[PDB]
Write a structure and sequence with these properties.
This is part of a larger assembly, with chains A (159 residues), B (208 residues), C (172 residues), D (33 residues) and E (292 residues).
Chain B (H helix, E strand, L loop, with lengths): L33 E3 L10 E14 H19 L4 E5 L5 E5 L11 E20 L4 H11 L7 E5 L12 H7 L3 E3 L4 E3 L6 H7 L7
Antiparallel strand pairs in B: 1-3, 2-5, 2-6, 3-5, 4-5, 7-8
Chain C lengths: L11 E9 L6 H14 L4 E4 L14 E8 L2 H13 L3 E3 L9 E5 L18 E8 L4 H4 L15 H12 L2 E3 L1
Parallel strand pairs in C: 4-7
Antiparallel strand pairs in C: 1-3, 1-6, 2-3, 5-6
Chain E lengths: L7 H5 L6 H4 L5 H8 L11 E7 L4 E7 L6 E7 L3 H4 L8 H19 L31 E3 L11 H10 L14 E2 L4 E2 L1 H8 L2 H11 L3 H7 L1 H5 L7 H14 L12 H9 L8 H14 L2
Parallel strand pairs in E: 1-4
Antiparallel strand pairs in E: 1-2, 2-3, 5-6
The chains are: A alpha+beta (159), B alpha+beta (208), C alpha+beta (172), D little secondary structure (33), E alpha+beta (292).
Chain E binds 3 RNA strands through helix 1, helix 2, helix 3, strand 1 and strand 2.
Chain lengths: 159, 208, 172, 33, 292
Amino acid sequence: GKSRGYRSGTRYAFQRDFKKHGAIPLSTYLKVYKVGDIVDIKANGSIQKGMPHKYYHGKTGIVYNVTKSSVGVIINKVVGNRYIEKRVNLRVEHVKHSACRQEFLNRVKSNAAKKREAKANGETVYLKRQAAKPRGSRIISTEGNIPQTLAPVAYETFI
Amino acid sequence: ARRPARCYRYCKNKPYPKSRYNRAVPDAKIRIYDLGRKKATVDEFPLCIHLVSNELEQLSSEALEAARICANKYITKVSGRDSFHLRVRVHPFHVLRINKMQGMRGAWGKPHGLAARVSIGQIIMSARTKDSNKDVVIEGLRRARYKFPGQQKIIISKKWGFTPLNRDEYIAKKTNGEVIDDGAYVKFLSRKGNLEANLQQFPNYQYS
Amino acid sequence: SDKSQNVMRELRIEKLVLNICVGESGDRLTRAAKVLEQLSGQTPVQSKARYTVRTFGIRRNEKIAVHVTVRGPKAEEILERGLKVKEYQLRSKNFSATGNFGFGIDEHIDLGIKYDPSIGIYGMDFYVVMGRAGARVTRRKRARSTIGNSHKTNKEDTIQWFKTRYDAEVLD
Amino acid sequence: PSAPSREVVKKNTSSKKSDAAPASADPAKAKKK
Amino acid sequence: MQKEFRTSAYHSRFQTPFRRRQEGKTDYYQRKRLVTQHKAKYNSPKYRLVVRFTNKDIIAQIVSAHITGDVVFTAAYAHELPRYGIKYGLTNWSAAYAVGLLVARRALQKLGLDETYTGVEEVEGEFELTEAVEDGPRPFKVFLDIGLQRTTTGARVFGVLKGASDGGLYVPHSPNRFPGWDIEAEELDAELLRKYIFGGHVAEYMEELLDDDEEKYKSIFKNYIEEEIESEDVEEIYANAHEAIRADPSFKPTEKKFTKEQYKAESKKYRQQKLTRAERQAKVAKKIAEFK
RNA sequence: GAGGUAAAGCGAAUGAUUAGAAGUCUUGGGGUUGAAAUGACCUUAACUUAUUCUCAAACUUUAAAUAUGUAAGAAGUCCUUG
RNA sequence: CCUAAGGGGGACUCAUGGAGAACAGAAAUCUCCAGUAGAACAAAAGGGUAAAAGUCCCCUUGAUUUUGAUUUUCAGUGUGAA
RNA sequence: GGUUGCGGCCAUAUCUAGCAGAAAGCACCGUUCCCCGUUCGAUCAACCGUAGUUAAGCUGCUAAGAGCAAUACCGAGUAGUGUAGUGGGAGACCAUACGCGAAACUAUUGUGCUGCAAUCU
């Protein structure tokens, strides 16, 4: 007999972290979520109300609704050959702001600051990020660092 | 009763131990893992000789018992029962299953026996003895090798007895008062914890 | 500082607990409760058996014993009234490692109360809980903590205090 | 008279024999023989 | 015979509670219920009336919670009462009422809701909630946080409750925990509550004790004796103070006899300092040597 | 961001498991003390302490590789105020 | 299966071990200390829970009314459940 | 800098055993008329701040302390693993090529930081 209940296979996913059981620290309840915020979903096993399904554990989405104790998050899930928009109601204990927003929102500010200064100096600045390039030429000094010769070592048993 | 060992030679299944899920499991044929003068102190037997696996393989408890008996018999016959301490280093914890004892319907087997799953380089049997008793103990293990399937190597250890220290580091820690007897084994000095207890337990500790 | 001869380190009785474990429920337990209310002047409380034992003739949640807690001067008076029956002689194996001691009388009329044939005689159990000032730390709701090692009550201090305050003997 | 009762603090809901109550764990009360 | 319990594995796997729970000071269940705000009232904070009693002081604070820590809006302490004319019994039920009234008036002064939301100017002990004025800002809403202190009818925390409510703050509450509440006949005897507001119970104890046990009266009510304060003029001490509290509820900090730097320099002299790694290494070497 | 598989671990929890050593028996027996004292001794077996060999699909503090969610702007960012 | 074993609030801390108290002993009741949960939570197993979700006490019927949205199984149909 | 009230992170904060603590605070501490709760004013309630004490709590310091945390020419580029071959080997398995890369272990260091308000020799 197969069993396919709602929380099947969540033995380790919904467990609390080691030495982290019990009450929720209240910064979780002091965070403010606005429509359009990007949030990570991670089910807290100790709060069983407003709990996400195991599919959304580890997914990231857009807040579309804000209620008394919960947020509505939009998730795109693959069903066959397309994506379906899923609307999940989650209590804020299972939700955290995505840290990818704060990094990109800082690059927007930095680009704006760099661009305005270049206009003040009448010069140009390039704001596109670049991949790591192959390193240039260089000269290796050997004063105090004369090359040491290594050889493969013979076989030994150490038991 | 017993199928030929070739039917259970390879680690094809996941480990299947006794648990709350399989309970009607027979006992292993091997019950004794330490033989000879197992109460000898560490300083009495400096030489260690291993029987080492060159195989990823399963060894039945029957083979472990047979090899243990063969090695023990030979070494006690040639050098005496108190000239060595033999230790079997693998315990059979994996349960083999038998089906016949319809067709393929409902074919989940019943417990049939026990086997130890050994890797390459895994020590099967260890024998601590005196140096002068090398050729005997080796010949004791070389016979026991015949009771096992696959390839095994007889390797003379670099270490003092069953200790993790080389035969030179042990002497250094011994003349420095960092080793005390614990019966058949020893305790080593620690530079951590209560200083007074450490000093009391190792009075001959020449601190540097 | 850290003076052992400090005013607040004074040993004194916290409470005296009087136990009568009559093995049954009904008239005998009610009369034992009457005896306890007579001795202490306080309404006692009945204890129920935690589980069933056929050998002892008790069953779970059957009201078996009755006990009462007295504190203050009345505890001291009852304690010395009970020590009179013991003729002021306890044993070294009557004091716990935590500094408490107890004894047991065998007839409750030796204490000095009127005897009634209807009531009969009940034995009685005496236990004294010793403690210095500041035990409220371990019993208050907010900022509850534990008592420091030097401030703890132990067997030797309680034995010496008992010998001094009552001129009695602790038979080692 | 009033009849207050001692309240329940334990959680053992089972109505059975308790832990560590075995025979032969006791000494010989008649060892003096 | 028995296993030693405090093993290294016991300490390794032990999960210590929250720092302020192990201190036995914060009930985080109640704190979560008090602090958490409706998520659609995004950054609007909930304001708590923190009321704490020490052996000598009454602390009343108006607090809003934030991620970096709680932020005090205003605070009134009982040791501020001597400025207003109450010098003794700084932990009465009436001192609690005075502290609540003071914190309410001070908060309303800080906000600007003084002329609007005056409160109960004629304290008769009737149960009443600060009702909003039509076509005007709503009254400052504050929730009572009594912490770990038990809820009993007649407790002093509800004295601060009644004072703050009468001071003009909107603090939701019921009158069934006030002194003078008849639980059998579910109505509040406002006469006894008014008695408690103006120190009536203390004055009655003074009068009842003076004619029965004069020696105990001399020790318990010393300060009143050397102040020539009798029972009949106890009430005015509170009755005037209320008025005075309403006249100037602004906070006046105590003038400090020393500066912050002087306090720090003085205190730093009596603070032991951690041994350097070399110092304890030398101690270990010496202890080894003296062991031979 | 999420994960608990490979590996690893077991002088870390749970469960399994080999060997001694040192202590306590006061809440184990046999024998030997006693004309009786439960108050010693020899022993095995128990526990306790610090160690020791070996393990787990339905054990685990830790914990990959591969695979997987989101973001990388004009429907954006900032300023003022309906 | 449950008028509480549902709902709210309050108070308390569990399993177990050690040391003590007449009968009383390995197991009755009382006291202190230790006690990260080794207990309990109707019923399988897993997860969760300690000033509680456990134990006890007080009050109750939100196990009510109206009809939408959403998650799982999914065809993104029904039913069940949330 | 100390202390209190309310906190954030939730042991670098816990645990064991010692020692010290000026000022204020906190605390223990005293009492039972009143509101209130108990077998018990022990807890809870109220009253006095008066009679006393730093003994305890609390705070800090000590320990080749237990635990915890961090780091690393520690182990180890090891174990494992993605990709590849008409590679080896009877097989079990193994080596090599292009990549990713642990855990234990070992050693060293550390042992709460901090926000708002009030207060203090």
